[PDB]
Amino acid sequence: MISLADLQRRIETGELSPNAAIAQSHAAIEAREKEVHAFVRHDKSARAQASGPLRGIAVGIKDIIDTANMPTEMGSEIYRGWQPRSDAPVVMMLKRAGATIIGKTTTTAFASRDPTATLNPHNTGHSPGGSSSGSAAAVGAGMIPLALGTQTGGSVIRPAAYCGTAAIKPSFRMLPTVGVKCYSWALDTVGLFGARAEDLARGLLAMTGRSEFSGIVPAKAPRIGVVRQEFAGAVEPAAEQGLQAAIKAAERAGASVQAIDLPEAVHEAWRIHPIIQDFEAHRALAWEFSEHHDEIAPMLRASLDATVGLTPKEYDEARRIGRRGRRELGEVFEGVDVLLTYSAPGTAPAKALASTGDPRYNRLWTLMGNPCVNVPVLKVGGLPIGVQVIARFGNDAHALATAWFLEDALAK
Amino acid sequence: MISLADLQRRIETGELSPNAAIAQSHAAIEAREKEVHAFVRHDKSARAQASGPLRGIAVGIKDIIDTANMPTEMGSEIYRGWQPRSDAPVVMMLKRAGATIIGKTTTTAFASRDPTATLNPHNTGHSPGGSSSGSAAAVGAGMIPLALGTQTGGSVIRPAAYCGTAAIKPSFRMLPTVGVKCYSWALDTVGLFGARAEDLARGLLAMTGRSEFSGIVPAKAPRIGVVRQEFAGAVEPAAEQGLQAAIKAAERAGASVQAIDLPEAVHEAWRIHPIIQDFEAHRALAWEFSEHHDEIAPMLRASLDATVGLTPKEYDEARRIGRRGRRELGEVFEGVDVLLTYSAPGTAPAKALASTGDPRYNRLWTLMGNPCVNVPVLKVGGLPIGVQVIARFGNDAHALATAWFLEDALAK
């Protein structure tokens, strides 16, 4: 995988020119795209900018995020050929920092369950996860140093885990979702994919300009609370094997690890995530459902058809439960620095299953809003398995810091 | 002005036909458009729908809100002829309820300070306010029974007061802003314009389907807290004339009125509203500012140019200040049901001043997020003056209930 930190360093000293770095990415995309299919559109003419911390840095953009120079098709036939007038604010944050938007990466239709044609870089017979399929696969295949995706359920952390890349779903609403196709406004969060936690920090620093992302260093003796999210049921063997390996490596590296049960209120929040999500989706995709119903990809069409009845009353109650969950979750972080849990149910599903994977181990955290970071741990049968590091809301820096610590601990 | 609730009742009993009601709006529009200039585009072919609570109800939509069958030009030459692919979720809420989207009402460029060509219905020589210029004007000129607008500063409450219409800026984030051009995501809130409080209530019931908007009746013996927002500056005589009149009428109606002071934390939130708004505006309009700078209307271009230096640090601090303000504001509602204050500095400015009016008595509330309702009170020199009713966050119903009580109180 291409390291954003490495490129920045070599570009800053003058060892690598911005143009050469971009040419590198075009070549890397050309090398594996015919086998992975991570891009909806690769702008072969994309050039490097001459200034900024991200000069010479190629970035892939999930196709539900607006671009003014390339189409944004939402992974749906309904938006085939659709060309937004402006670049979404998050896209502009990257461009103003000197980055090159090298192409639009694949997304499932409207960021839901319907699989894209993208294949897992580690084994093409498997799913790269979703809904940020192409962004995870592109980074995983060593095509680009950075990519943007989104998470409403587990569309950033799950695919990152399946593809063995580092990734972060920042604190809710920190990055604007303007120009980002909405599924659920109470949940949609923009995320980033990269080689390592350090790359994610560098990316957020250039995008936001916030000092909290400057000078991040691996955490020392982090106080970790292991949460297996029992309410979501047991995970597949590979995921547990990965968590156990992460725990052992953390303990050997000096971290204090303890198993913790989340408050009942939090379990309830996990239970109603679907209510909030599906109720809002009907409002957010109202035009599509009302005017192009049969044109909506099969799985999403089915889920929407099955939830037309969700009422404003049960929705409001769900939100109340969600808010209480966030409050009580904060109490958990009084005795621990970060939470460690699963990033997915197990290894990436075979493409034959027509599934991007169950988001059950990701959804609670999107609703709570906390910053989540995927840390690649190991591989079973050649397929990546990762773990999820979670910090207090707004403590993104420390989540990246602990993730970095975990990466080093796993490398020994 | 046309009453939505009136049309509803008559249509429901068969006393009035939906086609007749719609034909009446088309007529009212043509009757005074060449005088008011409230519409960017009037869809003369629009007809009444066959079912739903809003059948036969013509609705004007502020032109920063997406429509699939009509251009959405954002009041800017940059978006001339721009045609969104879909109808914004809030537009679909209206259509699904049976409403007729009769046209797009004028908006200042990107909903900022640049005046439109729309004139105040009460006096063609005066401004109708902004940024929802056309929606307030159209309703005030008796053209339509309902109109959608937005508020970031005071773009719903102020123009409503200027044009003498009822209007509500609901609790922040209740109505989705998907498909609504963003200025500041921490503030942008969709609002409604109507003849009276009752009309707004029926509109929200149809759009949201929430029981809280069903069966709303005038409030009884409301507990009112009068806040003149001294921290906002010196008010014009006309506005104080209206506030005193409202207080007198309320007291005579049985309301318990008392002047109260707002927590210093709240005064501070008012002070930093500009920091939040302008910093986010740069991110939200990054593409336009970077790629079409000289094409941005004069006044907005100047405000953006003057605020390019706002830092993430001071912005983050401003947001922290906003949160403290919200936290301490809640305590104020322990003794009073609603707060009562000015809706604008005074009477609508003359067009010659090239100003849509100062939002200083409005901005605080958009940041706090509480529901706000404008209640027309009286006229000075032929120009409307209203008062602003404010309820606790989430209590939009009570805000409307109390606004109703006030309208009838002023009606002696």
Side-chain angles (χ1 to χ4, degrees), chain A residues 78 96 185 210 290 316, chain B residues 85 96 173 210 290 316:
Chain A
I78 298 171
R96 286 181 170 193
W185 58 88
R210 299 183 67 170
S290 290
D316 294 332
Chain B
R85 173 79 171 114
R96 287 184 168 193
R173 290 187 57 137
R210 304 175 61 108
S290 295
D316 290 336

Side-chain angles (χ1 to χ4, degrees), chain A residues 22-291:
Chain A
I22 290 304
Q24 239 85 135
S25 300
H26 284 297
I29 294 170
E30 228 57 285
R32 314 268 278 83
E33 181 58 3
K34 292 186 176 180
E35 41 164 335
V36 177
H37 311 126
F39 287 79
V40 174
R41 303 176 175 302
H42 170 201
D43 180 10
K44 302 150 194 159
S45 71
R47 300 188 91 288
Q49 294 199 65
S51 62
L54 294 186
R55 62 183 183 286
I57 303 305
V59 188
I61 304 295
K62 183 179 184 176
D63 215 28
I64 48 165
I65 301 173
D66 291 349
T67 43
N69 70 320
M70 291 180 270
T72 305
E73 305 180 304
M74 320 301 172
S76 175
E77 309 172 303
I78 298 171
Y79 287 80
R80 180 75 169 86
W82 176 243
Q83 183 52 257
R85 175 64 167 129
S86 60
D87 280 312
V90 289
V91 168
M92 287 303 301
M93 294 179 155
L94 292 164
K95 295 206 306 176
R96 286 181 170 193
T100 299
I101 304 304
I102 204 164
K104 306 307 290 298
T105 53
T106 62
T107 177
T108 54
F110 303 107
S112 194
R113 305 183 304 168
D114 298 274
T116 66
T118 302
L119 308 171
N120 193 308
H122 299 277
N123 186 316
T124 57
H126 290 262
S127 172
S131 55
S132 310
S133 306
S135 286
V139 172
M143 289 182 207
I144 54 183
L146 189 72
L148 288 192
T150 66
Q151 172 155 318
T152 303
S155 293
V156 162
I157 301 295
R158 190 171 76 265
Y162 286 174
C163 295
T165 88
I168 178 175
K169 159 231 155 297
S171 295
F172 185 56
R173 293 197 313 181
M174 182 174 84
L175 295 178
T177 48
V178 178
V180 178
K181 188 61 178 166
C182 183
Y183 190 86
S184 173
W185 58 88
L187 298 161
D188 298 349
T189 311
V190 176
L192 290 62
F193 296 79
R196 299 191 63 188
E198 163 172 38
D199 301 306
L200 305 177
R202 283 273 117 190
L204 286 173
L205 175 56
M207 289 180 81
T208 70
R210 299 183 67 170
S211 64
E212 55 189 285
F213 296 119
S214 182
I216 292 184
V217 164
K220 306 297 177 184
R223 298 167 182 174
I224 304 173
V226 170
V227 293
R228 286 192 165 73
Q229 308 187 62
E230 297 74 10
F231 42 86
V235 77
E236 289 158 29
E240 172 61 14
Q241 283 163 41
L243 183 58
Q244 276 178 43
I247 290 175
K248 177 183 177 301
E251 284 178 347
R252 171 153 74 169
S256 59
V257 192
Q258 60 177 296
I260 301 178
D261 291 296
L262 300 171
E264 175 54 43
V266 178
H267 295 199
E268 278 292 84
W270 171 87
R271 181 180 63 82
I272 55 71
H273 169 283
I275 302 302
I276 295 179
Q277 179 180 71
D278 302 340
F279 181 84
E280 299 198 339
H282 267 288
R283 308 324 138 188
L285 299 172
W287 176 79
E288 289 87 347
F289 188 78
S290 290
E291 304 288 351

Side-chain angles (χ1 to χ4, degrees), chain B residues 16-38:
Chain B
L16 175 69
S17 74
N19 286 325
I22 291 302
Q24 287 163 48
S25 291
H26 283 299
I29 294 176
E30 296 261 282
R32 302 185 64 192
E33 253 304 274
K34 298 190 174 185
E35 170 197 359
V36 180
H37 309 87

Side-chain angles (χ1 to χ4, degrees), chain B residues 93-407:
Chain B
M93 288 175 169
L94 293 167
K95 303 206 316 179
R96 287 184 168 193
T100 295
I101 303 300
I102 202 160
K104 307 304 293 294
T105 55
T106 66
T107 178
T108 52
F110 301 112
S112 195
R113 310 211 316 302
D114 295 278
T116 61
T118 304
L119 307 173
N120 192 306
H122 297 276
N123 189 315
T124 300
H126 290 262
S127 164
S131 53
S132 308
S133 304
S135 297
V139 174
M143 297 180 172
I144 51 181
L146 185 70
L148 289 186
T150 66
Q151 175 161 308
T152 304
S155 294
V156 165
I157 297 296
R158 189 170 80 272
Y162 282 174
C163 297
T165 80
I168 175 175
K169 173 208 72 72
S171 294
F172 180 61
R173 290 187 57 137
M174 182 179 171
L175 295 178
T177 43
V178 177
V180 179
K181 189 63 178 168
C182 178
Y183 192 87
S184 171
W185 61 84
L187 299 159
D188 294 353
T189 308
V190 176
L192 286 64
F193 294 84
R196 302 188 55 179
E198 171 175 46
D199 303 306
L200 306 174
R202 296 303 297 179
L204 293 174
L205 174 61
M207 293 176 73
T208 72
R210 304 175 61 108
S211 61
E212 31 259 275
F213 296 119
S214 186
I216 290 183
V217 64
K220 286 288 185 294
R223 296 175 180 174
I224 304 170
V226 181
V227 304
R228 294 187 160 72
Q229 310 188 66
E230 311 69 26
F231 49 83
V235 76
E236 284 166 35
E240 174 66 8
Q241 285 172 51
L243 182 57
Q244 283 184 49
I247 292 176
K248 184 183 183 305
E251 290 176 352
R252 301 308 176 189
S256 57
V257 187
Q258 64 175 302
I260 58 176
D261 290 300
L262 294 169
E264 174 55 34
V266 178
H267 294 198
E268 276 291 79
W270 174 87
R271 183 181 65 75
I272 56 71
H273 171 282
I275 304 300
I276 295 174
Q277 181 184 71
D278 298 333
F279 179 90
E280 291 191 352
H282 269 288
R283 271 68 264 170
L285 298 171
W287 178 78
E288 290 86 345
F289 190 77
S290 295
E291 316 287 11
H292 300 286
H293 178 279
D294 295 356
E295 292 166 72
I296 291 174
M299 297 186 191
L300 170 57
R301 193 170 73 228
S303 61
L304 290 169
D305 282 346
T307 54
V308 298
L310 288 178
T311 69
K313 179 173 181 295
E314 64 189 307
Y315 161 69
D316 290 336
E317 183 51 51
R319 290 190 298 96
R320 309 184 211 298
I321 293 176
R323 284 177 299 184
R324 294 181 182 66
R326 294 193 187 75
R327 170 161 38 272
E328 292 195 45
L329 175 65
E331 311 182 3
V332 180
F333 290 92
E334 297 182 304
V336 303
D337 300 311
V338 307
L339 302 182
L340 186 65
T341 184
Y342 310 120
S343 291
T347 49
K351 292 291 297 189
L353 296 178
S355 168
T356 63
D358 184 345
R360 63 179 189 280
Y361 297 103
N362 305 293
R363 79 194 209 192
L364 174 64
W365 312 112
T366 310
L367 179 61
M368 296 295 90
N370 305 58
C372 301
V373 181
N374 175 254
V375 174
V377 182
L378 52 78
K379 310 172 66 174
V380 177
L383 286 299
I385 285 291
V387 291
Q388 177 173 21
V389 178
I390 308 164
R392 178 187 290 286
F393 185 79
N395 285 246
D396 305 57
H398 199 184
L400 292 167
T402 301
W404 198 331
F405 159 79
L406 199 170
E407 305 178 327

